[PDB]
Amino acid sequence: PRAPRTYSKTYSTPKRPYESSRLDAELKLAGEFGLKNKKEIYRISFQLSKIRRAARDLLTRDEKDPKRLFEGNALIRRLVRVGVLSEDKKKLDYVLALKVEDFLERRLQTQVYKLGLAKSVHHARVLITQRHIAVGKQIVNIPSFMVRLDSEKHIDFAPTSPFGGARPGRVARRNAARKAEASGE
Amino acid sequence: QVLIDTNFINFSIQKKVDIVRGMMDCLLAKCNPLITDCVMAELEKLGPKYRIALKLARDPRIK
Amino acid sequence: DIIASRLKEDVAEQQGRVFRYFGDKLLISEAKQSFTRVGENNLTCISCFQPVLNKYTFEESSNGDKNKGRLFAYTVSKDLQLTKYDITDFSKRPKKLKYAKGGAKYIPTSKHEYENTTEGHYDEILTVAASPDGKYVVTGGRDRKLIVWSTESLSPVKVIPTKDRRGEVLSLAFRKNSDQLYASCADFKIRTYSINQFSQLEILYGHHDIVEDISALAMERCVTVGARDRTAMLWKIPDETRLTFRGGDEPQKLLRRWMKEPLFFCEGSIDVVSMVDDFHFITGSDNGNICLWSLAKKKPIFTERIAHGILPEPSFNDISGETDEELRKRQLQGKKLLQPFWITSLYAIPYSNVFISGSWSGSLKVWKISDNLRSFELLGELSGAKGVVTKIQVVESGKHGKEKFRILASIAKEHRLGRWIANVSGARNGIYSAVIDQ
Amino acid sequence: APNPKAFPLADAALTQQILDVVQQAANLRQLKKGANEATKTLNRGISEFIIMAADCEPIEILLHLPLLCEDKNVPYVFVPSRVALGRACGVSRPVIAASITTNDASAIKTQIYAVKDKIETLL
Amino acid sequence: KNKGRISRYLANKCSMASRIDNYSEEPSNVFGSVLKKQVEQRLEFY
Numbered sequence: 001p002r003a004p005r006t007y008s009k010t011y012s013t014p015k016r017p018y019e020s021s022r023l024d025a026e027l028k029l030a031g032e033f034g035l036k037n038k039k040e041i042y043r044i045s046f047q048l049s050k051i052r053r054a055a056r057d058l059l060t061r062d063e064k065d066p067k068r069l070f071e072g073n074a075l076i077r078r079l080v081r082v083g084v085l086s087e088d089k090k091k092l093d094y095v096l097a098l099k100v101e102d103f104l105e106r107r108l109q110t111q112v113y114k115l116g117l118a119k120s121v122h123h124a125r126v127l128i129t130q131r132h133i134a135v136g137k138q139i140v141n142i143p144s145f146m147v148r149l150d151s152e153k154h155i156d157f158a159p160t161s162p163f164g165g166a167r168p169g170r171v172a173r174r175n176a177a178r179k180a181e182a183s184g185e
Numbered sequence: 186q187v188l189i190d191t192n193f194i195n196f197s198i199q200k201k202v203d204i205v206r207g208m209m210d211c212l213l214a215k216c217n218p219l220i221t222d223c224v225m226a227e228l229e230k231l232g233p234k235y236r237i238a239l240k241l242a243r244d245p246r247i248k
Numbered sequence: 249d250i251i252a253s254r255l256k257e258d259v260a261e262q263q264g265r266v267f268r269y270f271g272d273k274l275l276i277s278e279a280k281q282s283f284t285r286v287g288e289n290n291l292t293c294i295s296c297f298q299p300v301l302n303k304y305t306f307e308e309s310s311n312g313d314k315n316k317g318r319l320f321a322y323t324v325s326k327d328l329q330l331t332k333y334d335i336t337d338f339s340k341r342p343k344k345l346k347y348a349k350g351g352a353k354y355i356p357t358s359k360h361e362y363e364n365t366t367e368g369h370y371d372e373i374l375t376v377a378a379s380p381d382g383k384y385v386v387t388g389g390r391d392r393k394l395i396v397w398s399t400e401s402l403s404p405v406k407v408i409p410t411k412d413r414r415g416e417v418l419s420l421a422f423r424k425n426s427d428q429l430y431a432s433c434a435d436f437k438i439r440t441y442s443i444n445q446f447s448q449l450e451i452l453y454g455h456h457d458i459v460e461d462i463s464a465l466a467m468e469r470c471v472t473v474g475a476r477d478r479t480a481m482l483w484k485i486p487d488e489t490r491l492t493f494r495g496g497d498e499p500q501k502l503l504r505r506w507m508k509e510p511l512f513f514c515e516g517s518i519d520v521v522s523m524v525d526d527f528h529f530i531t532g533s534d535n536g537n538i539c540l541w542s543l544a545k546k547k548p549i550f551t552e553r554i555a556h557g558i559l560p561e562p563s564f565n566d567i568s569g570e571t572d573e574e575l576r577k578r579q580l581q582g583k584k585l586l587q588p589f590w591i592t593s594l595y596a597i598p599y600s601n602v603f604i605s606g607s608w609s610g611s612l613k614v615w616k617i618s619d620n621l622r623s624f625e626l627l628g629e630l631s632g633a634k635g636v637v638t639k640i641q642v643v644e645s646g647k648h649g650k651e652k653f654r655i656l657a658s659i660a661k662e663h664r665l666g667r668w669i670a671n672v673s674g675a676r677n678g679i680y681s682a683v684i685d686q
Numbered sequence: 687a688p689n690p691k692a693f694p695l696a697d698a699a700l701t702q703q704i705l706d707v708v709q710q711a712a713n714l715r716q717l718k719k720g721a722n723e724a725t726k727t728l729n730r731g732i733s734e735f736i737i738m739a740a741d742c743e744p745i746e747i748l749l750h751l752p753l754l755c756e757d758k759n760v761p762y763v764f765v766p767s768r769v770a771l772g773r774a775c776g777v778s779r780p781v782i783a784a785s786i787t788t789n790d791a792s793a794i795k796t797q798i799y800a801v802k803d804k805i806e807t808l809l
Numbered sequence: 810k811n812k813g814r815i816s817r818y819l820a821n822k823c824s825m826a827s828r829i830d831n832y833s834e835e836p837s838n839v840f841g842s843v844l845k846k847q848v849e850q851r852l853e854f855y
C-alpha cells in the first residue's frame with residue numbers, strides 16, 4: 001500500500017556488439033586503464049552520449065534564447081566542476097568534441113597511477129580496494145570515483161594505514177610475532 | 186571530416202535530410218562535409234534532371 | 249563611571265568587535281630598540297607567556313605562586329635549542345634562564361614512524377608556543393612530533409607524534425585563554441589540539457596548495473592562508489563549517505585604473521594572516537600586496553602595494569660580466585627586472601586595531617585601522633632589528649592608564665621556510681626588544 | 687638595435703602561470719632543477735621545455751643553453767627572478783634554470799602542453 | 810676520492826668560466842678572481 005519504488009537501467013548497449021573495430025576498441029581501452037567489464041565502458045559511454053545529445057539539441061536551438069543559454073551554462077558548469085572540459089574552451093562545440101578517453105582518464109585510480117604512488121594501474125586498483133588511499137577524510141574503495149579538481153589536488157594516503165601511519169598490519173605484525181618467537185624459543 | 190558522393194546526395198534528397206544537420210544527427214558531434222572536384226563533375230555529367238541536387242550540393246558550407 | 253567602564257571592558261573584552269584603538273597615545277617616536285645576539289644561528293622562534301590576573305576569578309595565571317606573575321619566554325633554534333627567558337625587567341633586557349638542546353641522538357632506531365616516541369628533539373624544531381596559562385611549552389618541528397616540555401625544569405614530558413610521513417609542523421597559534429591549540433601542517437591540513445588531556449580534537453582539510461599561516465582568537469574560528477592557490481579560509485569548529493575567501497587580483501586592471509587618472513606585481517603567493525578581531529583579518533601576500541578583509545564578503549576590504557619597500561636593483565658587473573658599460577646596463581635592461589619586498593613577520597596586537605609588519609627590509613612598519621573599519625594606514629617605523637625577523641610576540645605591563653608595550657621577536661639570518669635570503673645587509677641572529685609607551 | 691641575449695622575457699601573467707606549473711612539476715618529480723642537469727637532459731633528448739632566469743651573476747652561465755634549445759627545437763622562456771624561481775622550485779636556494787622533463791604518464795600533462803603552446807605563440 | 814672531490818669542484822668552476830668567456834665578448838677577471846679565491850677557500854677547507 002505504497003508507491004512503486006524508483007529504478008532505471010543506468011547503461012545502454014551497442015548496436016553491433018561483435019565487430020573487429022569495436023572489439024579491439026574495448027580491448028585497448030580496458031587494457032590501458034585496467035578495467036574488466038564491457039559494462040563499465042558502455043556505461044561511461046552512455047552517460048557521455050546523454051550529455052552530448054542534450055548539448056547537441058541545445059546547440060541546434062537559436063542564440064539569445066534563455067533556454068539554450070541557461071542549459072548550456074548549466075552543462076558547462078557541471079563539466080568544469082568535473083574537470084574534463086578545460087576552462088578556456090567553455091563552448092558548446094567543445095562539449096560536443098569531448099569523448100570517452102577523457103573520462104577514462106579522470107577516473108580515480110587512473111589519477112592514482114599517474115601521480116605514481118604505485119607503479120601499475122593494477123597496483124592502484126588493488127590499493128584502492130584494499131583501502132589505503134583517501135582524498136580528505138573518507139577512505140574511498142570504489143575505483144570509479146570520478147575525481148574533480150577540488151579533490152585531485154587532495155588525493156592522499158590513509159593516516160590509519162600502516163603505509164603512511166600506524167602500527168604494522170596483519171602479516172607484518174604476525175612476522176613480528178614470529179621473529180620474536182624465533183628470538184625467544 | 187566526411188566525404189560525400191553522388192549516391193549519398195541522391196538518397197539524401199530523396200529522403201529529405203538537410204546536409205549538415207543530418208550529419209550532426211548521425212555523428213552526435215562536430216563534423217565538416219567535403220566533396221571532391223571529381224564528385225562535383227560526376228553530378229554535373231549526370232546533368233539536367235538533377236541540377237537542383239547540384240545547386241544544393243554546391244553550398245559554401247561545403248569546402 | 250570609571251569603575252563601570254573598566255568593568256564593562258573587563259567583561260566585554262571577550263566578545264564584541266574591535267574595542268582597543270590605542271595607536272594615538274603611543275609614543276612611537278621614542279620607542280626604544282635593542283638587539284641581543286645569540287651565538288648559534290637559525291632562531292625560528294621566541295614566544296612569551298603573560299600571566300594575567302583573569303577577570304573571572306582573581307587568583308593568577310601561574311600554576312603555583314613561585315611565578316608571582318613574572319613574564320616568561322622561550323627561544324628555539326634549528327640547531328634544536330630551547331632556552332627559557334625572563335622578560336619582566338622592562339628597563340633591562342630579557343634574561344637567558346634555562347637551557348635544553350637536541351642533537352642527532354633522538355632519531356628513531358625504528359623507522360616505522362608510528363612510535364616516533366623518543367622524548368627529545370632530533371629533527372629541526374621550527375615552531376613553539378608558550379601556553380597562556382604557562383602550563384607547558386609546546387614544540388613542533390620537521391620531526392612531525394608535538395613534544396610538550398615542562399618549562400621550568402625544561403623537561404620533555406609528553407609527546408604527540410603527528411603520524412605523518414610529510415606532515416612537518418609548520419605554523420602554530422594558541423587560541424586565546426583556552427585549552428585548545430591550533431597547529432597547521434603542509435599536508436594541506438589544520439589540526440585542533442588539546443594539552444589539558446593531551447588529546448587531538450579535530451582534523452581539517454581544504455586548501456589546494458600547502459597552507460601557510462593561521463590565526464584565531466578565544467572563539468573557534470581559525471583563518472588560514474594557503475599560498476600559491478591564492479586562498480584564505482575561515483574554519484568554524486562548533487557548527488563545522490568552512491567559508492572560503494579568494495583574490496586573484498589583476499595587475500592589468502590595476503595599471504589601467506592607474507591610467508584612468510604604477511608598479512604592479514601579480515600575487516604569486518600568500519604568506520600571513522592575523523585575525524585582529526573576530527570579524528576582520530589581514531593577509532600578507534608575496535608581491536607586497538597586504539590585504540585587509542571583512543568577514544561577510546569574499547573580496548578584501550583593502551589591498552596595498554610595496555609596503556616593505558621594493559627591492560633595489562643589482563649592478564653592472566655582477567649582472568653582465570661583459571667589459572663594455574653600456575652593454576652591461578642594457579643587460580640590466582631597466583625596470584623589467586624589479587621586485588617588491590616581502591612580509592615575513594606581522595604581529596597583530598590582541599583585540600586591537602593595529603598590526604606591525606617587519607622583515608629583512610630593515611624597518612618594522614606599523615599600521616593602524618580607522619574606526620569606521622574601512623582602511624588602515626602606515627603610521628610608523630622601528631629600526632633596532634639587524635637580521636631577518638621571524639616571529640614576534642608582545643608583552644604589555646604597567647597600569648591601565650599608561651602601558652609599557654614590548655615587541656619581543658625571534659630574529660634569524662635565514663628565512664622562515666627556506667634560505668632564500670637575498671644576501672641581506674645588516675643581519676644578526678638574536679632577540680629583538682622594542683619597548684614603546686602609552 | 688640588438689636585444690639583450692635573454693630574449694624573450696614574459697608577462698607577469700605568464701610568469702605566474704609558469705611558476706604554478708613548475709611547482710606542480712616539483713611535486714610530481716618531473717621537474718629537474720639546475721643548469722647542469724638541463725644540459726644533460728637536452729643531450730639525452732628527454733627535456734620537454736626550459737625555464738630560465740634573467741638575473742643571476744652573471745647571465746652567460748645561463749646563456750649557454752639557447753644554442754642547445756634551438757638545436758633541438760625546444761621551447762625556452764625567461765623569468766626575471768631566480769629567487770621567485772627557487773620559491774617555485776621548493777628548494778633552499780635560488781635557481782637559474784629548470785627543466786620540465788618528458789612523461790606522457792602525468793597528471794599535469796595537459797597543463798604542460800597548454801603552457802608550451804603559450805611559449806610557442808610568444809616566440 | 811678526495812682529490813676527486815677537488816677536481817670535480819674545479820671542473821664545475823671551469824665550466825662556468827668557459828661559458829662566460831665563450832658567449833661574453835670580453836671577460837670578467839674579477840669573477841675569475843672570485844672563482845679562484847673560492848677555489849683556494851675550498852682548498853683550505855679540505
Ligand SMILES: [Zn+2]
Pocket residue numbers: 221222223224
Ligand atoms: Zn577526383
